[PDB]
Design a protein around this ligand. Sequence first.
Ligand SMILES: *[C@@H]1O[C@H](CO)[C@@H](O)[C@H](O)[C@H]1NC(C)=O
Lengths: 221, 220, 221
Amino acid sequence: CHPRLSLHRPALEDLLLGSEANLTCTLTGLRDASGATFTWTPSSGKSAVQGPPERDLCGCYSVSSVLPGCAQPWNHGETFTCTAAHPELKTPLTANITKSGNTFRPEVHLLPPPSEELALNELVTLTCLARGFSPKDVLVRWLQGSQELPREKYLTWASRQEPSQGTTTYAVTSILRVAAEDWKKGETFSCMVGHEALPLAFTQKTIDRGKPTHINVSVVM
Amino acid sequence: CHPRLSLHRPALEDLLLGSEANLTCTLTGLRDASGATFTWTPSSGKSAVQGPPERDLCGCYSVSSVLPGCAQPWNHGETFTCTAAHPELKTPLTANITKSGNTFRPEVHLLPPPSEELALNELVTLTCLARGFSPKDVLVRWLQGSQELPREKYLTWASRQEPSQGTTTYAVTSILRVAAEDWKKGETFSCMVGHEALPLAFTQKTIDRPTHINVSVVMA
Amino acid sequence: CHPRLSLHRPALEDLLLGSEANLTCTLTGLRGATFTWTPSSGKSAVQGPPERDLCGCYSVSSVLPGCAQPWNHGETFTCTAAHPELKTPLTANITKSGNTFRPEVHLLPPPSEELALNELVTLTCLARGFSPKDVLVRWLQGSQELPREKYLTWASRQEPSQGTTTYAVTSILRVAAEDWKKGETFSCMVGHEALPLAFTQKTIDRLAGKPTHINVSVVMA
Ligand SMILES: *[C@@H]1O[C@H](CO)[C@@H](O)[C@H](O)[C@H]1NC(C)=O
């Protein structure tokens, strides 16, 4: 029962919303000495910060390695490297990370409300569904008109892997509940999806009251 | 480290299409290798369940104490207390379990496939929603025709506490990918929603595949 | 013959798409020179390798790169020059804009007089009422982003109100009639500094211009 080292990726919210990029390197498990020598093999000057004295169960002392400024080298195709050596673990070990290939673009649907509650006039559901993208990293946001709703007025599941033929694609869902007065009045809403395979980082679908046309023809003798 | 105590519940996956009766309360923290029944309260149907597990290490153990009597005391809110006294305990570790009610019922809707997804005719998508009640676990099976499918052609998420006003409620969804021409031949599909607020613990719903032209002729 | 100094805000196509965002100070003269930047930022600049303009004085530029987070953070930048023909050093400065406004985007359906000739249909995108005058416009078909050589966008003029100062811009895209009658969908995207998620999208297809009900009556009397 002892862990080995591996390397995470930058967060997609930070990488897409324009702010920054980090890169984390972790080992843990036992409350031992602060000779946790983290060393980064590529480093443009501003090297890492040996992070805060974090604790885990039965005093499992975790400290990490985090470096700022990792947008352009991660995005154009570098190959980063983290190595470490400990007082207890004086035998050094190394992990690698690489930005993935073999990408597919998502497909996003928004679906109208449920005739059963369309008659009830209490609350309506709008469900957003995305399907068929290559890494398991997405964003979902909802809007109304031009105003962004807060992140507490809906719920979203995690991205499961779908089982189908050959390759491994993913999917994720979310639902939104809104009262009926504005829905029958004519207010509109939107579902946005962020993913790193789209060329402009985002797509957006909107829905509103999809009905067919009426035709009345009458002959009077 | 820590010998612990934590609150558990009978796993309700075995009361709808299951015929057995166990309790679902494993070790609270730590013990040693034993024959999985430590003595509780009941002199009520002494038909005690058993089974010897192997030995475990790395801090904890893999040893429970399971005792029967599940669906027969399932009327009026009785407690069942997980007991285990193996010599790492500095006191007899009589745990406790409290069962609340206020069980609410699913509101299952279904809905057509998306409109612009049917200009390519590769596959067909249907989604099945199930929302709004106080307990946690729900099951689901998909069927084409009338007989229920195995667990190798659908996908189902977990259940989250939905953001609602006033109440404490949940939700769960699941999707289905079938072919185009089989949907085009008028085949029908249903999802079953099994919960313990339903009278018979099943629910179904299914639609399938419109102009509004009306002509009227009156005289004089 | 005459000396001059300038700065420039970073371009929006680099602030929004790929974050390597420059910041340019020019000097137009030398009819040899050193530049100084008051925020330190570690990484020094590069001088222009000094082309000429307007049949006269050969200008010289210098570009401080890697300033994408202090631009959005609200910081201030000044660059100070020096030259033999200058008595005093010249200085200038640049800040991010305050009191912004976000745009309103509309996508209009084609005129019905156009569908009777079976050649090409015309889509129109309009964005109106945004306070800093810089913007981007991109078109799509389904998910495929179209190349830039297939449409036409105008510049960003100033619109005549009395309240504040605001701006507007248009764009057209002409697609084929056979692809319009099949049910292909098309989209318009706008990027602005003052939008919260940096992009907004509107779409269209062969429905949604059709009327909701038709009443015909023929009277044989
Ligand atoms: C810097 O910019 C301000 C406006 O923000 C201007 O008033 C001033 O003249 C500039 N130059 C300085 C402080 O040298």
